[PDB]
From a paper:
IGF-1R is closely related to the human insulin receptor (IR): their ectodomains share 53% sequence identity, their respective monomers can form functional heterodimers and both receptors can bind all three ligands within the family (insulin and the two insulin-like growth factors, IGF-I and IGF-II), albeit with varying affinities.
The structure of the IGF-1R ectodomain was obtained by X-ray diffraction analysis of a crystal of IGF-1RΔβ in complex with the Fv module of the monoclonal antibody (mAb) 24–6023, the latter employed here as a crystallization chaperone. First, the sites of membrane entry (i.e., the respective C termini of domains FnIII-3 and FnIII-3΄) are substantially closer together in IGF-1RΔβ (~67 Å) than in IRΔβ (~115 Å), i.e., the overall shape of IGF-1RΔβ is more “closed” than that of IRΔβ. The second difference lies in the IGF-1RΔβ αCT΄ residues 698–704, which are located C terminal to the αCT΄ helix (residues 684–696). These residues are well resolved and pack against the surface of the adjacent domain FnIII-2΄. Here, the observed interface is sparse, burying only ~896 Å2 of molecular surface from solvent and with low shape correlation (Sc = 0.47). The nature of the interface thus appears consistent with one that is capable of in vivo disassembly. In the apo IGF-1RΔβ structure, the αCT΄ helix spans residues 684–696 and engages (via the side chains of residues Tyr688, Phe692 and Phe695) a hydrophobic trough formed by the side chains of residues Leu32, Leu56, Phe58, Phe82, Tyr83, Val88 and Phe90 on the surface of L1-β2.
Residue numbers in the entry:
A (entry chain A): 1 to 37, 41 to 154, 162 to 508, 517 to 642, 682 to 704, 744 to 758
B (entry chain L): 0 to 107
C (entry chain A): 518 to 642, 682 to 704, 744 to 832
D (entry chain H): 0 to 117
């Protein structure tokens, strides 16, 4: 009688009756918030896969009162690396599991049991493996307990040797030395190697309380027979069993898969279901496609959590509604979730997305169908995006809208030419109406074609950079002109335009012979900075030809300086006449490390020592809130005024060209 | 969306002894995940053909399935006086499971 | 740090535009106001928006959390002081606490053993464990406490998080159940209990002989010493 | 083989009432096979409405019947149940119990339960 896949008994103490017939509990067992008010005893139960949890059970004095024959807790799935949790159990006096033999996986958590004795009387080192990670705190103090086994055997705990027992009447059962890793019957006759725990009969597959590997047809097999597959982690089932198993109900819930001789819930990472919902997984090349299916026909992306549900999807069976008013780093965060979406079965609506200046986060999206379209047969519908400068329609990208039209309205920063280039790749030239794309309220503030600002001279220090660009006469004589310098620390050159950019506004100088420049204040020595200037053309006469000026992203690295001292010098001696020494690279290298230079000087044997008469002494010497980081910083600042130019006891000098060890 | 199974013709007037063939076409491609069922009058439908072609232990040799992909056919070599009923095809590759409209095999 | 959601004007003219807010903290005042988005096909003339007043809506109250970190000591016999911290999620006005103390029986056996044979006689006076303890706090929601072998004594603490228990048996263990209620706990039900165990101070001079020792000669060269038993010992002689 | 499925008797109930249909397994391991439910009316013909896995207890419904049907199981009694609330004249049909197969095929079918809404 297998019970599962999870027993959760709580509140009602009579609800414990669900264990009348269970001999094995497939899955965890929860006995919580029970208030006992005749007793209940379950000698049928012997094995529990996964873990066992007990919490706030009043009236229960010993665990032997419930599960006396419990032998193996497999711990296939653990409660936070714990296979047995006994927490806040009142009236409990001892762990009465006197038939417990092997806990295959996980640790034990025994906490807050003011009456729990017989803890030190149990040698947990022979029933489980990871005894180091066990948690036994807050129980009855051993000083005020009084553990006394009836009157059995005993063994060594640390350097101590004391008796072992589970309760006041039963002792801790052990196996003789001759069986080794094997198991033993109550009468100390070795159990079949594939057995585990006890035996109904010595050396027999069909006489086992619990198998150590797997189970099938009453036999403890090492591996499952050829036509059976591993289910959970203890028994073998046939193929027709897993064709009837159904996972937890979800939007895309399906049956179980057969893979690598195991019957699991979903195909593992790097695998996809062969065919159409078949029982077997096939290796998928590179990235494995995850089609995402949702109950809501129109998924609305109005926050950052809503986008997390589309993480890793390749195809979307539904409609996408983007509505992003707020968000700083969402331009790169949406690309994490939606960057792999390639096909959309429905339509895409970009409404009120003021935070989006572009749609580049929708990478790999190359197909939009039109199974359902907005009123008026629209498959692409943007509206009221006060900052949408460009689409994701770079001339490198690919796109195909199968059916539907495109409507654009109230997008002022979007150049009207960009959406004409869209329907080229989209393939909907002439399919839209005359009002679907209008130059009114669209591209009103757009500055499409821009000029080029040319840098003229750059000068570098260890912390300052002077850069000057050419004077820029605006396209119209009456425009007021000003500049804006964008500079930010960029370790490498792949940089996106404005974002943690530092900005400063410098005006065009009055004298026409001097060109506009800017001086940067405090920069890190030897650090590559990305700089580009942008013009501010305030046109008194609006539109006609809105024309800005933008420069290329210039990468300027400051000079190098004196490096920092090496960090944490440690040294040891593995042999006489030899000294190993390791360290860490300095805090502020300020350039390429190139090499280290180490020096070792012999130290004189201590003064005096030769002088004292050590036959009179009794001991002769031998030899082998927290702002302290700011304190140590002061002493590192002192080491800048003194450097080292390389070339009684003499110094020996050697160069280490690569590693931090010598 | 769902998968609709269109079974044509809706009714076949047959005389016991004639060989007939039923057809069940699908919207999307089903490859192999199609099954057949026979339902006589005032009975429950019983399985005839698993997975488009392979037959069931118990059903007579007269019933045979064919097709793979989007067009599937059920053949009956010599209809008997017992085979007069209504026949369905079952979709089985994508949720939800859907059936055909049904083809009545009545007496001509 | 405003949360924003866009709801459209409903198509049917008889139903008015509304919005449903998803997951909010129980008993929490929220500032809400709606703003209209008027996309004018004809620009300017009279640019006119619509804005609402800032409406403050507080959600309902729920079952409180268990009191935090119950500590107890004994400054005198028949007295027990005990302090705690307000619950993590009160979900309303705390109003008062309700504490219960139950006498614990002196340990089973102990009376049974012959302690003249023993050598020691007993006496008495990376880190996700917050997520672990959260699971056990979630369990305490399905069971509440409706207020009104050893009996429970029940007292209400109306203000502070400290209280002193009176009239106790000296050197006896006590189970101290502490709950946390709120203003709506008379219908929602008061919270679960975070309990602790504490023993009182020993009654000074109560475990010595209360009378004189008498002797009577007996057969052989024997003497029978007779003395009275201490009526109220500290725990047990 | 001795496999058989026995469903509850016919029902004739007024509109707006809730009803549930039983289906007891026999001659087979009840926990090893899922149970499907199929609605056969005059219109729409055979409509698959849901399947329940007898092992774990999880279900999968047809979206046309999620807010209308509810499939439960009884491991001890070896019986499944198909609940239907706010019954309409449309729901007046014969419902079938199917098992002894898998999530893909319905090998054996129960005799059917006639629900008539007056
Ligand atoms: C409980 O039984 C399990 C399985 O029988 C034991 O797991 C063994 O763990 C060691 C660790 O290195 C492996 O080398 C063995 O191969 C495992 N056994 C098997 C059969 O594969 C575990 O040691 C047992 N624990 C105790 C306390 O006896
Ligand atoms: C920062 O580095 C630049 C070179 O990248 C230095 O410019 C050189 O200065 C030396 C002066 O000793 C001249 O001999 C070189 O001809 C200069 N090279 C170039 C390309 O101009 C600059 O001096 C460094 N800054 C400081 C403060 O030393
Ligand atoms: C949340 O609080 C409101 C009151 O602020 C509750 O509304 C009351 O509900 C009770 C039902 O027992 C009625 O008797 C009262 O007349 C209602 N008062 C008002 C002003 O409407 C509301 O029920 C509470 N929410 C929940 C879930 O209990
Ligand atoms: C357990 O076994 C008994 C027979 O001893 C049976 O009557 C009962 O239905 C079974 N199941 C439960 C949950 O008790
Ligand atoms: C730039 O390229 C480097 C290395 O190729 C990579 O680590 C970094 O994430 C890239 N950054 C951007 C913004 O592309
Ligand atoms: C510093 O190291 C980088 C990385 O190898 C190299 O590209 C660069 O040229 C080096 N700089 C100098 C001055 O050698
Ligand atoms: C809760 O306490 C606040 C502060 O004293 C008070 O203003 C409010 O009225 C109280 N609520 C109730 C329901 O008594």
């Amino acid at each position: 009688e297998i019970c599962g896949p999870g027993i959760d008994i709580r509140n009602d103490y009579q609800q414990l009756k669900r264990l009348e017939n269970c001999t094995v509990i497939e899955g965890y067992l929860h006995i919580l918030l029970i208030s006992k008010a005749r007793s209940y005893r379950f000698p049928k139960l012997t094995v529990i896969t996964e873990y066992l949890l007990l919490f706030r059970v009043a009236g229960l004095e010993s665990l032997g009162d419930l599960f006396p024959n419990l032998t193996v807790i497999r711990g296939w799935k653990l409660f936070y690396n714990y296979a047995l949790v006994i927490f806040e159990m009142t009236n409990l006096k001892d762990i009465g599991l006197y038939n417990l033999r092997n806990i295959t996986r996980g640790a034990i958590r025994i906490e807050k049991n003011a009456d729990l004795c017989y803890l030190s009387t149990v040698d947990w080192s022979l029933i489980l493996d990871a005894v180091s990670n066990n948690y036994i705190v807050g129980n009855k103090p051993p000083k005020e307990c009084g553990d006394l086994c009836p009157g059995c055997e005993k063994t060594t705990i640390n350097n101590e040797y004391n008796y072992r027992c589970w309760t006041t009447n039963r002792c801790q059962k052990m196996c003789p030395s001759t069986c080794g890793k094997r198991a033993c019957t109550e009468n100390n006759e070795c159990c079949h190697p594939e057995c585990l725990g006890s035996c109904s009969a010595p050396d027999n597959d069909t006489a086992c309380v619990a198998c150590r590997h797997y189970y099938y047809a009453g036999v403890c097999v090492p591996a499952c027979p050829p036509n059976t597959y591993r289910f959970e982690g203890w028994r073998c089932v046939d193929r027709d069993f897993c064709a009837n198993i159904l996972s937890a109900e979800s939007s895309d819930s399906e049956g179980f898969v057969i893979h690598d001789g195991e019957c699991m819930q979903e195909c593992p990472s790097g695998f996809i279901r062969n065919g159409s919902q078949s029982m077997y997984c096939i290796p998928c090349e590179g990235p494995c496609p995850k089609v995402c299916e949702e109950e809501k026909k129109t998924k609305t992306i109005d926050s950052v959590t809503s986008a997390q549900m589309l993480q890793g999807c390749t195809i979307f069976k539904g409609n996408l509604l983007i509505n992003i008013r707020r968000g700083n780093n969402i331009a790169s965060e949406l690309e994490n979730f939606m960057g792999l979406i390639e096909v959309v079965t429905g339509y895409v609506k970009i409404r009120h997305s003021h935070a989006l200046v572009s749609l580049s986060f929708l990478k790999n999206l190359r197909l939009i169908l039109g199974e359902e379209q907005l009123e008026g047969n629209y498959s692409f519908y943007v509206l009221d995006n006060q900052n949408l400068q460009q689409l994701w329609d770079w001339d490198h990208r690919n796109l195909t809208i199968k059916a539907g039209k495109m409507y654009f309205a109230f997008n002022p920063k979007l150049c009207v030419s960009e959406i004409y280039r869209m329907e080229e790749v989209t393939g909907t030239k002439g399919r839209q109406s005359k009002g679907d794309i209008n130059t009114r309220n669209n591209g009103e503030r757009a500055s499409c074609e821009s000029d080029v600002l040319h840098f003229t001279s750059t000068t570098t220090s260890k912390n300052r950079i002077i850069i000057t660009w050419h004077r820029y006469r605006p396209p119209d004589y009456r425009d007021l002109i000003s500049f804006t310098v964008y500079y930010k620390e960029a370790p490498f050159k792949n940089v996106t335009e404005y974002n943690s950019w530092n900005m400063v506004d410098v005006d065009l100088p009055p004298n026409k012979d001097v060109e506009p420049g800017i001086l940067l204040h405090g920069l890190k020595p030897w650090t590559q900075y990305a700089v580009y200037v942008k013009a501010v053309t305030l046109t008194m006469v609006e539109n006609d030809h809105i024309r800005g000026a933008k420069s290329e992203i210039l990468y300027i690295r400051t000079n190098a300086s004196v490096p920092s001292i090496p960090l944490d010098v440690l040294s040891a001696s593995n042999s006489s006449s030899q000294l190993i020494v390791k360290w860490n690279p300095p805090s502020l290298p300020n350039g390429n490390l190139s090499y280290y230079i180490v020096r070792w000087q012999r130290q004189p044997q201590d003064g005096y020592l030769y002088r004292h008469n050590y036959c009179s002494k009794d001991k002769i010497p031998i030899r082998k809130e927290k702002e302290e980081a700011e304190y140590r910083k002061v002493f590192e600042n002192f080491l800048h005024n003194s450097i080292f130019v390389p070339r009684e006891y003499p110094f020996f000098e050697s160069r280490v060209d690569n590693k931090e060890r010598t | 969306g769902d998968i609709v199974l269109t079974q044509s013709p809706a009714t076949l007037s047959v005389t016991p002894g004639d060989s007939v063939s039923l057809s069940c076409r699908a919207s999307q491609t089903i490859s192999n995940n199609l099954h057949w069922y026979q339902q006589k009058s005032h009975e429950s439908p019983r399985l005839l053909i698993k997975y488009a072609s392979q037959s069931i232990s118990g059903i007579p040799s007269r019933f045979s399935g064919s097709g793979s992909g989007t067009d599937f056919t059920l053949s009956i070599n010599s209809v008997e006086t017992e085979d007069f009923g209504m026949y369905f095809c079952q979709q089985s590759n994508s949720w939800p499971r859907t059936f055909g409209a049904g083809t009545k095999l009545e007496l001509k | 740090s405003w949360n924003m959601v866009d709801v459209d004007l409903p198509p049917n003219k008889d139903v008015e535009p509304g919005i449903l807010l998803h997951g909010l903290k129980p008993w929490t005042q929220y500032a809400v106001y709606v703003k209209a988005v008027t996309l004018t096909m004809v620009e300017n003339d009279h640019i006119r928006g619509a804005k609402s007043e800032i409406l403050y809506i507080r959600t309902n109250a729920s079952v409180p959390s268990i009191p935090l970190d119950v500590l107890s000591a004994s400054n005198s016999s028949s007295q027990l002081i005990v302090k705690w911290n307000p619950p993590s999620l009160p979900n309303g006005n705390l109003s008062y606490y309700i504490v219960r103390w139950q006498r614990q029986p002196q340990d089973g056996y102990l009376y049974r053993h012959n302690y003249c044979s023993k050598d020691k006689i007993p006496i008495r006076k990376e880190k996700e464990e917050a997520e672990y303890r959260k699971v056990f706090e979630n369990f305490l929601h399905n069971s509440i406490f409706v207020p009104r072998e050893y009996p429970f004594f029940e007292s209400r603490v109306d203000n502070k998080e400290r209280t002193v228990i009176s009239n106790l048996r000296p050197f006896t263990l006590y189970r101290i159940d502490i709950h946390s209620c709120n203003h709506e706990a008379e219908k929602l039900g008061c919270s679960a209990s975070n309990f602790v165990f504490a023993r009182t101070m020993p009654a000074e001079g109560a475990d010595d002989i209360p009378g004189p020792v008498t002797w009577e000669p007996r057969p052989e060269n024997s003497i029978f010493l007779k003395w009275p038993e201490p009526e109220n010992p500290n725990g047990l002689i | 083989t001795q496999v058989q499925l026995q469903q509850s008797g016919p029902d004739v109930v007024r509109p707006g009432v809730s009803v549930k249909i039983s289906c007891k397994g026999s001659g087979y391991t009840f926990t090893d096979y899922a149970i499907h439910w199929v609605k056969q009316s005059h219109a729409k013909s055979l409509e698959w409405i849901g399947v329940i896995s007898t092992y774990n207890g999880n279900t999968k419904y047809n979206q046309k019947f999620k807010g209308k049907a509810a499939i439960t199981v009884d491991k001890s009694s070896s019986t499944a149940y198909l609940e239907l609330a706010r019954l309409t004249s449309e729901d007046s049909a014969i419902y079938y119990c199917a098992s002894y197969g898998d999530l893909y095929v319905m090998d054996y079918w129960g005799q059917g339960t006639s629900v008539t809404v007056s």
